[PDB]
Design a protein around this nucleic acid. Structure first.
Lengths: 143, 100, 206, 37, 262
RNA sequence: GAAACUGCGAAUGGCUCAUUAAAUCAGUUAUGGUUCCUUUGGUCGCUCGACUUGGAUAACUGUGGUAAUUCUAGAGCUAAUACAUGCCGACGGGCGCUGACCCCCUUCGCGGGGGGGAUGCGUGCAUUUAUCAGUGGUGACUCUAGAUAACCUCGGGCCGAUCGCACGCCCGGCGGCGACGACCCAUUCGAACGUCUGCCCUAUCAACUUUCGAUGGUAGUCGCCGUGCCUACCAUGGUGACCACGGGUGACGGGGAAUCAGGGUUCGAUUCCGGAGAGGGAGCCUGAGAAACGGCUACCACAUCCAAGGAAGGCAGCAGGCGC
């Protein structure tokens, strides 16, 4: 199911060819009181940039956005809305800044409109500097 | 032996260029016909070929094997050494002394 | 020379950047080593901070590790088989990190034989006339045989490694960048990796 | 200096780990107390 | 620029040097050393401006090039050498000993000590580090490495070192009810008792400190230096003992002293 | 004590504002994704295998060439912390494998239990790779230590063939205080690349980007490191009426300046911080640090001296001169 590309997909930490007579999984708690989810501990994907089961460390900023598009692979576009205060007219103006964000295959069923918390880490790509730490499903979505 | 001369414009002969004509080389450190001003500097200096041609101003010779006759200029006199060996080992090496 | 910077290319949107300064040194780029297989050739490079960086240009030996039973031996590289990145790097047989190369099986065989008291490689019926291997497989004292019989209990190698040993060329993956450190250190392919790579080269075979 | 410095620290740490081991028997005596007060 | 800078313009110089505007263009760019450039006091500024032994740069050079000045029991013939917080300047020939400690305001005090007190100093530990063969290392605030420390000392404790041997005598552990001087921020030179440490995972931990007159002030944990057990200072404190009375009180004390003086 | 070889500095300072509109820059944070001359404090018999070696060069003596310049070829001599090569000591043994050979007991005995153990190999820090276990620290390491199996670039990691004042301590013996150097670690001065928010006018600029990388994925190449930075093969993305894309700017940005009841409008080339440039572009040498111009190499523009062959240039440094 995995190992679709040319090179062999594996977790570089663990050794998988111990002489004997299921594969163990590398994972870590990421601090700041975030819960290492179950698809990370139990699942069978290979992701360099998964913040729980991969080589990337969360440090600096922690922000939240709402999911806009999910079309490019293992990555989403979130949209961060705020108000900017002009001082001449004692009023605000509605602005937005949509940023590219790495979504782990851990967070399996995520829909658009979900309130996604992200954490800053080392530059992953040209435009990607953040990584999804948790997802809150949009108000309801029970039915 | 012929140890290189100067062109009729004053450009010195540089060994291992293999020409009778004159050439522009980029002379860095570890090259003749150039001394540098700044440490880690290179310079375009025009140098004449190593081969001897009808167009030359000087040729600098050194006598390898002394002949039979007394040449009136050179072999007449003998030069005394300006200095003597400074390093202790070079003094021992020359004057043929033991260690004790 | 070669610039290695972000400001020469378009923005997240697709607008054109205007370069606010000319090319800087620290934004450097040197040509690819494209290290080949021949007799040892390394050139040194003075890099930023006044450190040294070794360009392996030709390389035939490397420190490979068959790390199933923890046996690593310096070994002679012969040729390259498969490469995940690009396919022309196998034609022009260049070493790069995460290549698939064949290595001399003899140091690993020697160790396995001298350790476990069993033969490896050595096809059926072939006469062992030299008989210094005889002294390595026979003539043990009293309690040393208790040691070598509790040892050879778990001497069982896998079939896919036995096949390669019988031929005389093991498959190994280069784990050290040969262009940067001037080396070819790697590890021998085993089990799931070995099955995956044997299949990929047979799909390449056709 | 290396010999004297390594010697003195080895005494100090052996004392410190014995203070922490008088705490380890307190950790064992914590557990016997926890179960059987 | 294309490398490290060597000049320091007189306006861009740290303010607690109290440099005038019309003397020169440049200020003494402090030589690299144990303390930071913005949190130091160069030997030239301390010697010529505060004590006023020297009149000019030439006189400071002449005073120090006779091997007279001794910063932390080691002779320094360098005019721009950064003498910082918790140092023992020992001018030998006059028989004086000065310790650089923050005045009640954001500046260094000319604080004379006794030769018995001028034989140790009070260093804060910055990191505890495991060596090349399990040899534990301390690194203190003044860039000073000590290997084989006490196995108890941890990353915000204060140690007391002997100045010749350069080894730990005692240590004050970072916890509630310990005297701390503030060595950064607006509260620069306030002496008070630690009240509460508030952990902030990712951010800088903020520590609430209480003064001797029930005045309470916070500062981030980077800018705290414990100098005492309970309410007991382990060194001599400057006149005022790091209180910072209000401008209203400081006005009253000044003019009332003037009235009584005459 | 001239000169000269050696080390270091010349990357700071000074000048100007032509570029440059999410760029520069300012406040806030990150390097757990890096490099660092110097300063300061650590390390510097931790490695089991010479009472001082080697051969050149400069200055200096001497002979020259050119119309020409901080141009230089040839000869004879002589130094080093330049350039090279290399010991001894500590050193007696430990420590992990290798294992000849030997004593002892339970079984009649095989068998079963350990004790020693000749010999050979290996060893320290640094470098590169693979495997195993779990001294100290973090909110979090694939961290810092520890163990094992190997490797060590000949265009080479370290493990003092250096100098100065003091001068000593008992039968030829016989120690302090400094300078200089050196792999690694920390510290300082920094630099570099990222995070969040923020800029003037324009719709007679409404669609823009992309197989010659535009947005992602995997594997490498290069780099001081993180990344389409650059390759190969995949995927079809990314931005926009919340003004993208294009254009204009008599635009270097900010701290600030003039004006002001309160709001505000206009200015900020200008002594402090940051950026950029040295006539226009490009490339590089040396070094910890430069794409350096009071460094080099060309090509465009301009231009100086010519015995006509060649040669030397760069004031947006301080003065000063033309032109405007």
């Amino acid at each position: 199911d995995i190992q679709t590309e040319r090179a062999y997909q594996k977790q570089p930490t663990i050794f998988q060819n111990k002489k004997r007579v299921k594969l163990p999984r590398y994972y870590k708690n990421i601090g700041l009181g975030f819960k290492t989810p179950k698809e990370a501990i139990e699942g069978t994907y290979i992701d360099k940039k998964c913040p729980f089961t991969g080589n990337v460390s969360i440090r600096g900023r922690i922000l939240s956005g709402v999911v806009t598009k999910m079309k490019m692979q293992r990555t989403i576009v979130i949209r961060r809305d705020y108000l900017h205060y002009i001082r001449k007219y004692n009023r605000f103006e509605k602005r937005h800044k949509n940023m590219s964000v790495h979504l782990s295959p851990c967070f399996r069923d995520v829909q658009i409109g979900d309130i996604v918390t992200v954490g800053e880490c080392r530059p992953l790509s040209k435009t990607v500097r953040f990584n999804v730490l948790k997802v809150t499903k949009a108000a309801g979505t029970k039915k | 032996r012929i140890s290189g001369g100067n062109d009729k414009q004053g450009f010195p002969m540089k060994q291992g260029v293999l020409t009778h004509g004159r050439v522009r080389l980029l002379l860095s450190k570890g090259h003749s016909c150039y001394r540098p001003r700044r440490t880690g500097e290179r310079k375009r200096k025009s140098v004449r070929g190593c081969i001897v041609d009808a167009n030359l101003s000087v040729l600098n010779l050194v006598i390898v094997k002394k002949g039979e006759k007394d040449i009136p200029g050179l072999t007449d006199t003998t030069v005394p050494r300006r200095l003597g060996p400074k390093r202790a080992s070079r003094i021992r090496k020359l004057f043929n002394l033991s260690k004790e | 020379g070669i610039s290695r910077d972000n400001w020469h290319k378009r923005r997240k949107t697709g607008g054109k950047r205007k370069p606010y300064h000319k090319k800087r040194k620290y934004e450097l780029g040197r040509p690819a080593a494209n290290t080949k297989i021949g007799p040892r050739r390394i050139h040194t490079v003075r890099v930023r901070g006044g450190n040294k960086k070794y360009r392996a240009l030709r390389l035939d030996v490397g420190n490979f590790s068959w790390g199933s039973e923890c046996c690593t031996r310096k070994t002679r590289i012969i040729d390259v088989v498969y490469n995940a990145s690009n396919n022309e790097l196998v034609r022009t047989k260049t070493l790069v990190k995460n290549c698939i190369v064949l290595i001399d099986s003899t140091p690993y065989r020697q160790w396995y034989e001298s350790h476990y008291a069993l033969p490896l490689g050595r096809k059926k019926g072939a006469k062992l006339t030299p008989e210094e291997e005889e002294i390595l497989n026979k003539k043990r004292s009293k309690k040393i045989q208790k040691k070598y019989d509790e040892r050879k209990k778990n001497a069982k190698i896998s079939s896919l490694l036995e096949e390669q040993f019988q031929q005389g060329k093991l498959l190994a993956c280069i784990a050290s960048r040969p262009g940067q450190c001037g080396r070819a250190d790697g590890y021998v392919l085993e089990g799931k990796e070995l099955e995956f790579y044997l299949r990929k080269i047979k799909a390449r075979k056709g | 200096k290396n010999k004297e410095e390594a010697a003195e620290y080895a005494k100090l740490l052996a004392k410190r780990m014995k203070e922490a081991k008088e705490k380890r028997q307190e950790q064992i005596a914590k557990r016997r107390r926890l179960s059987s007060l | 620029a294309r490398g490290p800078k060597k000049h320091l313009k007189r306006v861009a110089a740290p303010k607690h040097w109290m440099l005038d505007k019309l003397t020169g263009v440049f200020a003494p760019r402090p030589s690299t050393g144990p303390h930071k450039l913005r949190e130091c006091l160069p030997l030239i500024i301390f010697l010529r401006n505060k004590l006023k032994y020297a009149l000019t740069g030439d006189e400071v050079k002449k005073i120090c090039m006779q091997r007279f000045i001794k910063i932390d029991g080691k002779v320094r013939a360098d005019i721009t050498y950064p003498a910082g917080f918790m140092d023992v300047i020992s001018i030998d020939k006059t028989g004086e000993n000065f310790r650089l400690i923050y005045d009640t305001k954001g500046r260094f005090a000319v604080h004379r000590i006794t030769p018995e007190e001028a034989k140790y100093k009070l260093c804060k530990v910055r990191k505890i580090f495991v060596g090349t063969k399990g040899i534990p290392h301390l690194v203190t605030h003044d860039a000073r490495t000590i290997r084989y420390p006490d196995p108890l000392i941890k990353v915000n404790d204060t140690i007391q070192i002997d100045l010749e041997t350069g080894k730990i005598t005692d240590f004050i552990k970072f916890d509630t009810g310990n005297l701390c001087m503030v060595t950064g921020g607006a509260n620069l030179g306030r002496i008070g008792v630690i009240t509460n440490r508030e952990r902030h995972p990712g951010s800088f931990d903020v520590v609430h400190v209480k003064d001797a007159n029930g005045n309470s002030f916070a500062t981030r944990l980077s800018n705290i230096f414990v100098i005492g057990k309970g309410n007991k200072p382990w060194i001599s404190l400057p006149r005022g003992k790091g209180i910072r009375l209000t401008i209203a009180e400081e006005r009253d004390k000044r003019l009332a002293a003037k009235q009584s003086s005459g």
